[PDB]
Amino acid sequence: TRKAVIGYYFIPTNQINNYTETDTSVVPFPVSNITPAKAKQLTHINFSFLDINSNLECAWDPATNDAKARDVVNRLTALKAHNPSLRIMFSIGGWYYSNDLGVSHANYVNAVKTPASRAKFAQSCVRIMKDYGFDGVDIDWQYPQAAEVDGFIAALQEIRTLLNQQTITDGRQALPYQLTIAGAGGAFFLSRYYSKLAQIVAPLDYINLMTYDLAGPWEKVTNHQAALFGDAAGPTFYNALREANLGWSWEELTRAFPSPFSLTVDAAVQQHLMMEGVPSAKIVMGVPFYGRAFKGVSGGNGGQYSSHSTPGEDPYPSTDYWLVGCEECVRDKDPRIASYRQLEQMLQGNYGYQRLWNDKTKTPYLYHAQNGLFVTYDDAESFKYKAKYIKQQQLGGVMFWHLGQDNRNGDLLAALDRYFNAADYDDSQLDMGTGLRYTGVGPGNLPIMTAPAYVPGTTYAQGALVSYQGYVWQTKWGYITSAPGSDSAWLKVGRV
Ligand SMILES: CC(=O)N[C@@H]1[C@@H](O)[C@H](O[C@@H]2O[C@H](CO)[C@@H](O[C@@H]3O[C@H](CO)[C@@H](O[C@@H]4O[C@H](CO)[C@@H](O[C@@H]5O[C@H](CO)[C@@H](O)[C@H](O)[C@H]5NC(C)=O)[C@H](O)[C@H]4NC(C)=O)[C@H](O)[C@H]3NC(C)=O)[C@H](O)[C@H]2NC(C)=O)[C@@H](CO)O[C@H]1O
Description:
monomer, alpha/beta, TIM Barrel, Chitinase A, domain 3, Seminal Fluid Protein  PDC-109 (Domain B), 3 domains, 5-stranded antiparallel beta sheet, 19% strand, globular, binds a molecule of 5 linked components (NAG-NAG-NAG-NAG-NAG), Chitinase_insertion_sf, glycosidase, endochitinase activity
Protein backbone atom coordinates (compact mmCIF):
# COMPACT_ATOMS: atom_id res chain seq x y z
CA THR A 1 0.00 0.00 0.00
CA ARG A 2 1.40 3.41 -1.01
CA LYS A 3 3.22 5.30 1.76
CA ALA A 4 1.58 8.60 2.71
CA VAL A 5 3.64 11.74 1.95
CA ILE A 6 1.99 14.39 4.06
CA GLY A 7 3.04 17.96 3.51
CA TYR A 8 1.92 20.60 6.01
CA TYR A 9 1.83 23.94 4.18
CA PHE A 10 1.91 27.11 6.27
CA ILE A 11 0.82 30.51 4.95
CA PRO A 12 0.63 33.23 7.61
CA THR A 13 -2.56 35.31 7.62
CA ASN A 14 -0.90 38.40 6.19
CA GLN A 15 0.38 36.39 3.26
CA ILE A 16 -3.12 35.18 2.48
CA ASN A 17 -4.13 38.83 2.75
CA ASN A 18 -1.41 39.99 0.34
CA TYR A 19 -1.23 36.83 -1.70
CA THR A 20 0.71 36.85 -4.95
CA GLU A 21 2.53 34.32 -7.07
CA THR A 22 4.89 36.94 -8.42
CA ASP A 23 6.74 38.55 -5.52
CA THR A 24 8.74 36.28 -3.18
CA SER A 25 9.45 39.15 -0.80
CA VAL A 26 5.71 39.08 -0.01
CA VAL A 27 4.83 35.39 -0.47
CA PRO A 28 8.09 33.37 -0.45
CA PHE A 29 6.47 30.08 -1.53
CA PRO A 30 3.24 30.63 -3.54
CA VAL A 31 1.13 27.64 -4.63
CA SER A 32 2.51 28.04 -8.17
CA ASN A 33 5.70 26.51 -6.82
CA ILE A 34 3.76 23.24 -6.65
CA THR A 35 3.85 22.00 -10.25
CA PRO A 36 1.82 19.01 -11.51
CA ALA A 37 4.92 16.85 -11.02
CA LYS A 38 5.19 18.01 -7.41
CA ALA A 39 1.46 17.53 -6.82
CA LYS A 40 2.06 13.92 -7.88
CA GLN A 41 4.75 13.41 -5.21
CA LEU A 42 2.32 14.41 -2.43
CA THR A 43 -0.63 12.39 -1.13
CA HIS A 44 -1.79 15.02 1.38
CA ILE A 45 -1.31 18.77 1.76
CA ASN A 46 -2.29 20.06 5.22
CA PHE A 47 -3.14 23.74 4.85
CA SER A 48 -1.95 25.40 8.09
CA PHE A 49 -3.44 26.81 10.22
CA LEU A 50 -7.12 27.37 11.11
CA ASP A 51 -8.11 28.01 14.76
CA ILE A 52 -10.91 27.49 17.29
CA ASN A 53 -12.54 30.87 18.05
CA SER A 54 -14.33 32.27 21.11
CA ASN A 55 -17.65 30.80 19.91
CA LEU A 56 -15.85 27.44 20.24
CA GLU A 57 -16.08 26.56 16.51
CA CYS A 58 -13.46 25.97 13.84
CA ALA A 59 -12.72 29.18 11.95
CA TRP A 60 -10.07 31.12 10.08
CA ASP A 61 -8.04 33.74 11.88
CA PRO A 62 -10.23 36.80 12.65
CA ALA A 63 -8.00 39.03 10.52
CA THR A 64 -8.31 36.84 7.43
CA ASN A 65 -9.54 38.26 4.13
CA ASP A 66 -12.09 35.53 3.22
CA ALA A 67 -11.97 36.15 -0.53
CA LYS A 68 -8.20 35.70 -0.66
CA ALA A 69 -8.43 32.65 1.59
CA ARG A 70 -10.89 30.94 -0.75
CA ASP A 71 -8.71 31.88 -3.72
CA VAL A 72 -5.63 30.29 -2.12
CA VAL A 73 -7.53 27.17 -1.06
CA ASN A 74 -8.95 26.86 -4.60
CA ARG A 75 -5.46 27.10 -6.05
CA LEU A 76 -4.51 24.13 -3.83
CA THR A 77 -7.55 21.92 -4.55
CA ALA A 78 -6.99 22.63 -8.28
CA LEU A 79 -3.83 20.56 -7.88
CA LYS A 80 -6.13 17.56 -7.47
CA ALA A 81 -6.51 17.58 -11.24
CA HIS A 82 -2.91 16.31 -11.52
CA ASN A 83 -3.11 13.58 -8.87
CA PRO A 84 -6.42 11.73 -8.20
CA SER A 85 -5.14 10.46 -4.82
CA LEU A 86 -4.24 13.95 -3.51
CA ARG A 87 -6.08 15.37 -0.51
CA ILE A 88 -6.02 19.00 0.59
CA MET A 89 -6.64 18.85 4.34
CA PHE A 90 -6.75 21.75 6.73
CA SER A 91 -5.10 21.71 10.12
CA ILE A 92 -6.54 23.24 13.24
CA GLY A 93 -4.20 24.60 15.89
CA GLY A 94 -0.45 24.69 15.55
CA TRP A 95 2.08 26.07 18.02
CA TYR A 96 1.08 29.76 17.93
CA TYR A 97 -2.62 29.14 18.60
CA SER A 98 -2.65 26.08 20.86
CA ASN A 99 0.31 25.78 23.22
CA ASP A 100 -0.39 26.09 26.97
CA LEU A 101 0.20 29.86 26.62
CA GLY A 102 -1.11 30.23 23.08
CA VAL A 103 -3.51 32.98 22.05
CA SER A 104 -6.49 30.62 21.61
CA HIS A 105 -5.60 28.02 24.22
CA ALA A 106 -8.79 28.38 26.26
CA ASN A 107 -10.99 27.88 23.19
CA TYR A 108 -9.42 24.44 22.75
CA VAL A 109 -9.99 23.49 26.38
CA ASN A 110 -13.60 24.70 26.26
CA ALA A 111 -14.52 23.36 22.84
CA VAL A 112 -14.09 19.78 24.10
CA LYS A 113 -15.64 20.11 27.58
CA THR A 114 -19.26 19.04 27.06
CA PRO A 115 -21.25 16.81 24.71
CA ALA A 116 -22.85 19.95 23.30
CA SER A 117 -19.59 21.86 22.89
CA ARG A 118 -18.16 18.79 21.16
CA ALA A 119 -21.22 18.41 18.91
CA LYS A 120 -21.00 22.07 18.02
CA PHE A 121 -17.23 22.05 17.46
CA ALA A 122 -17.35 18.88 15.35
CA GLN A 123 -20.09 20.18 13.04
CA SER A 124 -18.16 23.44 12.55
CA CYS A 125 -15.22 21.29 11.33
CA VAL A 126 -17.25 19.48 8.72
CA ARG A 127 -18.94 22.77 7.63
CA ILE A 128 -15.63 24.51 7.17
CA MET A 129 -14.29 21.48 5.27
CA LYS A 130 -17.22 21.50 2.82
CA ASP A 131 -17.56 25.20 2.57
CA TYR A 132 -13.94 25.71 1.52
CA GLY A 133 -13.51 22.44 -0.35
CA PHE A 134 -11.11 20.59 1.97
CA ASP A 135 -10.69 16.79 2.02
CA GLY A 136 -10.20 16.12 5.70
CA VAL A 137 -9.39 17.54 9.12
CA ASP A 138 -6.05 17.50 10.97
CA ILE A 139 -6.22 18.45 14.69
CA ASP A 140 -2.92 19.96 15.90
CA TRP A 141 -3.53 20.89 19.53
CA GLN A 142 -0.24 21.01 21.45
CA TYR A 143 -1.44 19.56 23.78
CA PRO A 144 -4.51 18.71 25.82
CA GLN A 145 -3.60 18.08 29.46
CA ALA A 146 -4.41 14.76 31.14
CA ALA A 147 -7.79 15.92 32.43
CA GLU A 148 -8.72 17.14 28.95
CA VAL A 149 -7.91 13.93 27.16
CA ASP A 150 -11.27 12.18 27.57
CA GLY A 151 -13.10 15.18 26.10
CA PHE A 152 -10.55 15.49 23.30
CA ILE A 153 -11.02 11.80 22.54
CA ALA A 154 -14.80 12.31 22.44
CA ALA A 155 -14.44 15.22 20.04
CA LEU A 156 -12.45 13.03 17.64
CA GLN A 157 -14.98 10.21 17.76
CA GLU A 158 -17.59 12.85 17.05
CA ILE A 159 -15.69 14.25 14.05
CA ARG A 160 -15.12 10.69 12.66
CA THR A 161 -18.90 10.01 12.80
CA LEU A 162 -19.80 13.26 11.01
CA LEU A 163 -17.02 12.70 8.44
CA ASN A 164 -18.01 9.10 7.73
CA GLN A 165 -21.60 10.30 7.25
CA GLN A 166 -20.36 13.02 4.94
CA THR A 167 -18.35 10.52 2.87
CA ILE A 168 -21.50 8.47 2.26
CA THR A 169 -23.65 11.53 1.49
CA ASP A 170 -21.02 12.75 -1.03
CA GLY A 171 -20.24 9.43 -2.71
CA ARG A 172 -16.58 9.76 -1.77
CA GLN A 173 -15.81 6.08 -1.13
CA ALA A 174 -13.00 6.39 -3.69
CA LEU A 175 -11.31 8.97 -1.43
CA PRO A 176 -13.01 9.09 2.03
CA TYR A 177 -12.84 12.24 4.09
CA GLN A 178 -10.08 11.80 6.66
CA LEU A 179 -9.24 12.68 10.24
CA THR A 180 -5.72 12.97 11.63
CA ILE A 181 -3.84 14.73 14.45
CA ALA A 182 -0.27 15.85 14.98
CA GLY A 183 1.15 14.08 18.02
CA ALA A 184 4.08 14.84 20.31
CA GLY A 185 7.32 13.32 19.07
CA GLY A 186 9.02 13.30 22.44
CA ALA A 187 8.28 11.60 25.78
CA PHE A 188 8.01 14.89 27.71
CA PHE A 189 4.60 16.05 26.43
CA LEU A 190 3.48 12.68 24.98
CA SER A 191 3.07 11.67 28.64
CA ARG A 192 -0.04 13.89 28.90
CA TYR A 193 -2.21 11.58 26.80
CA TYR A 194 0.02 8.53 26.31
CA SER A 195 -2.02 6.19 28.47
CA LYS A 196 -5.07 6.69 26.21
CA LEU A 197 -3.26 6.42 22.87
CA ALA A 198 -5.44 3.54 21.66
CA GLN A 199 -8.61 5.60 22.10
CA ILE A 200 -6.99 8.65 20.51
CA VAL A 201 -5.79 6.74 17.43
CA ALA A 202 -8.97 4.70 16.81
CA PRO A 203 -10.87 7.53 15.08
CA LEU A 204 -7.86 8.60 12.99
CA ASP A 205 -6.54 7.64 9.57
CA TYR A 206 -3.08 8.68 10.78
CA ILE A 207 -1.29 10.21 13.73
CA ASN A 208 1.47 12.54 12.46
CA LEU A 209 4.35 12.35 14.93
CA MET A 210 6.16 15.66 15.15
CA THR A 211 9.49 13.93 15.41
CA TYR A 212 11.52 17.10 15.16
CA ASP A 213 12.34 20.00 17.53
CA LEU A 214 13.83 17.36 19.84
CA ALA A 215 16.57 19.96 20.37
CA GLY A 216 16.34 23.74 20.57
CA PRO A 217 17.63 26.78 22.54
CA TRP A 218 15.64 25.49 25.55
CA GLU A 219 18.13 22.62 26.07
CA LYS A 220 21.53 23.41 27.62
CA VAL A 221 23.46 21.07 25.29
CA THR A 222 23.18 21.49 21.51
CA ASN A 223 21.84 18.38 19.84
CA HIS A 224 20.40 17.09 16.58
CA GLN A 225 16.71 18.02 16.41
CA ALA A 226 15.68 14.78 14.67
CA ALA A 227 18.32 12.15 15.24
CA LEU A 228 17.00 8.88 13.78
CA PHE A 229 19.01 6.79 16.23
CA GLY A 230 20.92 7.79 19.36
CA ASP A 231 24.57 8.68 19.83
CA ALA A 232 26.06 7.62 23.16
CA ALA A 233 28.05 10.86 23.26
CA GLY A 234 24.90 13.00 23.14
CA PRO A 235 22.52 13.95 25.97
CA THR A 236 19.90 11.61 27.41
CA PHE A 237 16.50 12.30 28.98
CA TYR A 238 14.19 11.10 31.76
CA ASN A 239 11.69 8.65 30.24
CA ALA A 240 8.56 10.46 31.34
CA LEU A 241 6.41 7.65 30.00
CA ARG A 242 7.27 5.37 32.91
CA GLU A 243 5.07 7.60 35.09
CA ALA A 244 1.93 7.46 32.93
CA ASN A 245 -1.25 6.02 34.42
CA LEU A 246 -0.85 2.76 32.51
CA GLY A 247 -1.69 0.33 35.30
CA TRP A 248 1.39 -1.78 34.50
CA SER A 249 3.71 -3.53 36.95
CA TRP A 250 7.25 -2.44 37.74
CA GLU A 251 8.75 -5.13 35.49
CA GLU A 252 6.48 -4.01 32.64
CA LEU A 253 7.23 -0.32 33.10
CA THR A 254 10.95 -1.04 33.31
CA ARG A 255 11.17 -3.20 30.20
CA ALA A 256 8.98 -0.74 28.25
CA PHE A 257 10.60 2.53 29.41
CA PRO A 258 14.39 2.56 29.89
CA SER A 259 15.55 5.79 31.56
CA PRO A 260 17.41 7.85 30.84
CA PHE A 261 17.11 7.45 27.09
CA SER A 262 18.19 8.99 23.79
CA LEU A 263 15.53 11.37 22.40
CA THR A 264 15.27 10.19 18.80
CA VAL A 265 12.79 9.72 15.97
CA ASP A 266 13.23 6.01 16.59
CA ALA A 267 12.34 6.40 20.29
CA ALA A 268 9.02 8.12 19.50
CA VAL A 269 7.96 5.59 16.87
CA GLN A 270 8.76 2.68 19.15
CA GLN A 271 6.99 4.28 22.09
CA HIS A 272 3.86 4.39 19.98
CA LEU A 273 4.18 0.82 18.72
CA MET A 274 4.48 -0.40 22.29
CA MET A 275 0.84 0.43 22.89
CA GLU A 276 -1.83 -2.12 22.19
CA GLY A 277 -4.37 -0.61 19.80
CA VAL A 278 -1.86 1.53 17.86
CA PRO A 279 -1.23 -0.07 14.40
CA SER A 280 2.06 0.73 12.68
CA ALA A 281 0.09 1.52 9.50
CA LYS A 282 -1.52 4.54 11.25
CA ILE A 283 1.85 5.95 12.31
CA VAL A 284 3.41 8.69 10.13
CA MET A 285 6.96 9.90 10.84
CA GLY A 286 7.39 13.65 10.62
CA VAL A 287 10.66 15.18 9.36
CA PRO A 288 11.51 18.89 9.31
CA PHE A 289 12.24 20.96 6.18
CA TYR A 290 14.15 23.52 8.30
CA GLY A 291 17.19 23.71 10.57
CA ARG A 292 17.83 25.10 14.06
CA ALA A 293 20.84 27.32 14.72
CA PHE A 294 22.76 27.70 18.02
CA LYS A 295 25.49 30.24 18.82
CA GLY A 296 28.40 30.37 21.22
CA VAL A 297 29.27 26.71 20.73
CA SER A 298 32.69 25.09 21.11
CA GLY A 299 34.65 23.31 18.43
CA GLY A 300 35.75 19.78 19.13
CA ASN A 301 32.80 17.74 18.06
CA GLY A 302 31.76 20.14 15.33
CA GLY A 303 29.40 22.11 17.52
CA GLN A 304 27.62 18.97 18.70
CA TYR A 305 26.75 18.39 22.37
CA SER A 306 28.21 21.71 23.39
CA SER A 307 26.97 24.43 25.70
CA HIS A 308 25.62 27.53 23.89
CA SER A 309 24.37 31.11 24.35
CA THR A 310 21.24 31.00 22.20
CA PRO A 311 18.23 33.01 23.53
CA GLY A 312 15.18 30.83 24.29
CA GLU A 313 12.56 33.60 24.22
CA ASP A 314 9.62 33.12 21.85
CA PRO A 315 9.43 35.20 19.70
CA TYR A 316 13.12 36.03 19.21
CA PRO A 317 13.93 39.13 21.36
CA SER A 318 16.53 41.16 19.47
CA THR A 319 17.72 42.61 16.17
CA ASP A 320 21.00 40.77 16.47
CA TYR A 321 20.80 38.47 13.48
CA TRP A 322 23.86 36.31 13.93
CA LEU A 323 23.17 33.43 11.48
CA VAL A 324 25.88 34.22 8.96
CA GLY A 325 24.65 34.51 5.40
CA CYS A 326 21.02 33.95 6.36
CA GLU A 327 18.97 36.63 4.64
CA GLU A 328 15.73 34.82 5.47
CA CYS A 329 16.58 35.26 9.17
CA VAL A 330 16.51 39.05 8.81
CA ARG A 331 13.11 39.49 7.23
CA ASP A 332 11.54 36.93 9.59
CA LYS A 333 13.56 38.28 12.52
CA ASP A 334 15.00 35.05 13.98
CA PRO A 335 18.52 33.73 13.48
CA ARG A 336 17.59 30.51 15.29
CA ILE A 337 15.57 29.00 12.39
CA ALA A 338 16.33 28.62 8.67
CA SER A 339 14.43 26.86 5.91
CA TYR A 340 16.26 24.14 4.05
CA ARG A 341 15.95 26.41 1.01
CA GLN A 342 18.07 29.00 2.81
CA LEU A 343 20.53 26.56 4.44
CA GLU A 344 21.33 25.31 0.97
CA GLN A 345 22.19 28.80 -0.16
CA MET A 346 24.28 29.40 2.95
CA LEU A 347 26.29 26.32 1.99
CA GLN A 348 27.04 27.59 -1.51
CA GLY A 349 27.86 31.16 -0.60
CA ASN A 350 31.26 30.48 1.01
CA TYR A 351 29.93 31.73 4.33
CA GLY A 352 32.31 29.61 6.36
CA TYR A 353 30.00 26.70 7.10
CA GLN A 354 31.26 23.13 6.97
CA ARG A 355 28.74 20.31 6.41
CA LEU A 356 29.35 17.37 8.68
CA TRP A 357 27.63 14.00 9.17
CA ASN A 358 26.90 11.89 12.29
CA ASP A 359 26.73 8.25 11.18
CA LYS A 360 25.08 7.22 14.45
CA THR A 361 22.12 9.59 14.29
CA LYS A 362 22.15 9.51 10.45
CA THR A 363 21.69 13.27 10.17
CA PRO A 364 23.80 16.19 8.88
CA TYR A 365 24.76 19.39 10.68
CA LEU A 366 26.57 22.66 9.97
CA TYR A 367 29.48 24.05 11.94
CA HIS A 368 30.88 27.56 11.60
CA ALA A 369 34.35 27.48 13.12
CA GLN A 370 34.90 31.24 13.03
CA ASN A 371 31.74 32.38 14.84
CA GLY A 372 30.97 29.30 16.92
CA LEU A 373 27.69 28.27 15.27
CA PHE A 374 25.94 24.88 15.01
CA VAL A 375 22.95 23.99 12.85
CA THR A 376 20.96 20.78 12.98
CA TYR A 377 18.74 20.04 9.99
CA ASP A 378 17.75 17.19 7.64
CA ASP A 379 18.42 16.58 3.95
CA ALA A 380 17.94 14.19 1.04
CA GLU A 381 20.64 11.99 2.61
CA SER A 382 19.14 11.69 6.08
CA PHE A 383 15.77 11.06 4.40
CA LYS A 384 17.16 7.81 2.92
CA TYR A 385 17.51 6.27 6.36
CA LYS A 386 14.21 7.61 7.57
CA ALA A 387 12.44 6.35 4.44
CA LYS A 388 13.95 2.87 4.87
CA TYR A 389 13.06 2.96 8.59
CA ILE A 390 9.45 3.76 7.58
CA LYS A 391 9.34 0.78 5.19
CA GLN A 392 11.04 -1.55 7.69
CA GLN A 393 8.74 -0.69 10.61
CA GLN A 394 5.71 -0.79 8.29
CA LEU A 395 4.65 2.78 9.18
CA GLY A 396 1.95 4.72 7.32
CA GLY A 397 4.36 7.12 5.66
CA VAL A 398 6.14 10.40 6.24
CA MET A 399 4.96 13.90 7.12
CA PHE A 400 6.86 17.16 6.97
CA TRP A 401 6.89 20.70 8.24
CA HIS A 402 6.63 22.34 5.91
CA LEU A 403 6.29 22.47 2.10
CA GLY A 404 7.04 26.19 2.01
CA GLN A 405 10.58 25.50 3.17
CA ASP A 406 11.85 23.17 0.39
CA ASN A 407 14.22 24.62 -2.25
CA ARG A 408 12.73 25.79 -5.57
CA ASN A 409 13.45 22.52 -7.42
CA GLY A 410 11.74 20.76 -4.51
CA ASP A 411 14.49 18.25 -3.79
CA LEU A 412 13.29 17.23 -0.28
CA LEU A 413 9.79 16.34 -1.39
CA ALA A 414 11.27 14.68 -4.47
CA ALA A 415 13.69 12.55 -2.42
CA LEU A 416 10.90 11.34 -0.14
CA ASP A 417 8.79 10.35 -3.14
CA ARG A 418 11.82 8.78 -4.84
CA TYR A 419 12.66 6.55 -1.85
CA PHE A 420 9.14 5.15 -1.65
CA ASN A 421 8.23 4.90 -5.32
CA ALA A 422 11.02 5.33 -7.85
CA ALA A 423 11.63 2.05 -9.66
CA ASP A 424 15.26 3.09 -10.32
CA TYR A 425 16.06 3.59 -6.61
CA ASP A 426 17.18 0.61 -4.52
CA ASP A 427 18.04 0.82 -0.78
CA SER A 428 18.32 -2.89 -0.05
CA GLN A 429 22.04 -2.20 0.71
CA LEU A 430 21.56 0.98 2.76
CA ASP A 431 23.27 0.27 6.11
CA MET A 432 21.19 1.59 9.01
CA GLY A 433 24.30 1.88 11.24
CA THR A 434 24.96 1.19 14.93
CA GLY A 435 23.33 4.23 16.57
CA LEU A 436 21.43 3.35 19.73
CA ARG A 437 17.99 1.77 19.20
CA TYR A 438 15.15 2.30 21.67
CA THR A 439 15.02 -1.15 23.30
CA GLY A 440 11.67 -0.81 25.07
CA VAL A 441 9.00 -3.49 24.71
CA GLY A 442 5.37 -3.26 25.68
CA PRO A 443 1.90 -4.87 25.34
CA GLY A 444 1.48 -3.82 21.71
CA ASN A 445 4.76 -5.08 20.29
CA LEU A 446 5.75 -8.22 22.19
CA PRO A 447 7.85 -10.83 20.34
CA ILE A 448 6.05 -13.75 18.74
CA MET A 449 6.89 -16.92 20.66
CA THR A 450 5.84 -20.43 21.67
CA ALA A 451 5.39 -22.33 24.93
CA PRO A 452 3.59 -25.39 26.37
CA ALA A 453 -0.05 -24.53 27.11
CA TYR A 454 -0.75 -23.69 30.74
CA VAL A 455 -1.75 -26.80 32.72
CA PRO A 456 -4.12 -26.19 35.72
CA GLY A 457 -2.90 -27.96 38.82
CA THR A 458 0.79 -27.80 37.81
CA THR A 459 3.46 -26.17 40.00
CA TYR A 460 5.89 -23.98 38.07
CA ALA A 461 9.46 -23.17 39.02
CA GLN A 462 11.05 -19.76 38.37
CA GLY A 463 11.48 -18.67 34.74
CA ALA A 464 8.97 -21.24 33.50
CA LEU A 465 7.20 -20.46 30.21
CA VAL A 466 3.68 -21.40 29.17
CA SER A 467 0.98 -20.46 26.67
CA TYR A 468 -2.28 -18.93 27.86
CA GLN A 469 -4.91 -16.56 26.41
CA GLY A 470 -2.80 -16.42 23.24
CA TYR A 471 0.25 -15.08 25.07
CA VAL A 472 3.43 -16.60 26.46
CA TRP A 473 4.00 -15.90 30.15
CA GLN A 474 7.01 -16.24 32.38
CA THR A 475 7.04 -16.68 36.16
CA LYS A 476 9.06 -14.12 38.15
CA TRP A 477 9.80 -16.55 41.01
CA GLY A 478 9.28 -20.14 42.18
CA TYR A 479 6.47 -22.45 43.27
CA ILE A 480 3.85 -20.86 41.05
CA THR A 481 0.51 -22.59 41.34
CA SER A 482 -1.64 -19.75 40.05
CA ALA A 483 -2.71 -19.25 36.42
CA PRO A 484 -1.05 -16.60 34.18
CA GLY A 485 -2.35 -13.07 34.63
CA SER A 486 -4.44 -14.48 37.47
CA ASP A 487 -1.54 -13.71 39.84
CA SER A 488 1.27 -11.16 40.08
CA ALA A 489 3.89 -13.91 39.62
CA TRP A 490 3.50 -14.16 35.84
CA LEU A 491 5.02 -11.77 33.28
CA LYS A 492 3.45 -11.64 29.81
CA VAL A 493 6.57 -11.79 27.59
CA GLY A 494 5.36 -12.87 24.14
CA ARG A 495 2.38 -13.32 21.80
CA VAL A 496 0.67 -16.11 19.84
C1 LIG B 1 11.76 26.15 30.06
C2 LIG B 1 12.31 24.88 29.44
O1 LIG B 1 13.51 24.80 29.16
N1 LIG B 1 11.45 23.89 29.22
C3 LIG B 1 11.86 22.76 28.41
C4 LIG B 1 10.84 22.51 27.30
O2 LIG B 1 10.74 23.67 26.47
C5 LIG B 1 11.26 21.25 26.48
O3 LIG B 1 10.19 20.87 25.57
C6 LIG B 1 10.24 21.44 24.31
O4 LIG B 1 9.51 22.67 24.35
C7 LIG B 1 9.53 23.36 23.09
C8 LIG B 1 8.75 24.65 23.27
O5 LIG B 1 9.31 25.44 24.30
C9 LIG B 1 8.89 22.51 21.99
O6 LIG B 1 9.01 23.21 20.74
C10 LIG B 1 7.87 23.28 19.97
O7 LIG B 1 7.74 22.05 19.29
C11 LIG B 1 6.54 21.96 18.52
C12 LIG B 1 6.49 20.55 17.96
O8 LIG B 1 6.47 19.58 19.00
C13 LIG B 1 6.56 23.03 17.41
O9 LIG B 1 5.28 23.06 16.77
C14 LIG B 1 5.05 22.28 15.64
O10 LIG B 1 6.27 22.24 14.85
C15 LIG B 1 6.43 23.27 13.86
C16 LIG B 1 7.92 23.58 13.78
O11 LIG B 1 8.44 24.03 15.04
C17 LIG B 1 5.58 24.48 14.17
O12 LIG B 1 5.91 25.54 13.27
C18 LIG B 1 5.79 26.85 13.74
O13 LIG B 1 4.43 27.27 13.54
C19 LIG B 1 4.19 28.63 13.97
C20 LIG B 1 2.71 28.90 13.80
O14 LIG B 1 1.95 28.12 14.71
C21 LIG B 1 5.06 29.59 13.14
O15 LIG B 1 4.86 30.92 13.58
C22 LIG B 1 6.52 29.21 13.31
O16 LIG B 1 7.32 30.00 12.47
C23 LIG B 1 6.72 27.74 12.94
N2 LIG B 1 8.10 27.35 13.16
C24 LIG B 1 8.81 26.93 12.12
C25 LIG B 1 10.16 26.31 12.42
O17 LIG B 1 8.41 27.02 10.96
C26 LIG B 1 4.11 24.07 14.01
O18 LIG B 1 3.27 25.13 14.45
C27 LIG B 1 3.82 22.85 14.90
N3 LIG B 1 2.98 21.86 14.23
C28 LIG B 1 3.59 20.99 13.38
C29 LIG B 1 2.59 20.00 12.89
O19 LIG B 1 4.76 20.92 13.00
C30 LIG B 1 6.85 24.43 17.99
O20 LIG B 1 7.17 25.30 16.93
C31 LIG B 1 8.02 24.43 18.98
N4 LIG B 1 8.05 25.70 19.71
C32 LIG B 1 8.96 26.62 19.42
C33 LIG B 1 8.72 28.03 19.98
O21 LIG B 1 9.96 26.40 18.72
C34 LIG B 1 9.61 21.14 21.90
O22 LIG B 1 8.95 20.31 20.96
C35 LIG B 1 9.64 20.47 23.29
N5 LIG B 1 10.46 19.26 23.24
C36 LIG B 1 9.89 18.06 23.25
C37 LIG B 1 10.82 16.85 23.15
O23 LIG B 1 8.66 17.90 23.32
C38 LIG B 1 11.53 20.06 27.41
C39 LIG B 1 12.11 18.86 26.67
O24 LIG B 1 13.18 19.24 25.80
O25 LIG B 1 12.47 20.42 28.44
C40 LIG B 1 12.01 21.50 29.27
O26 LIG B 1 12.96 21.71 30.28
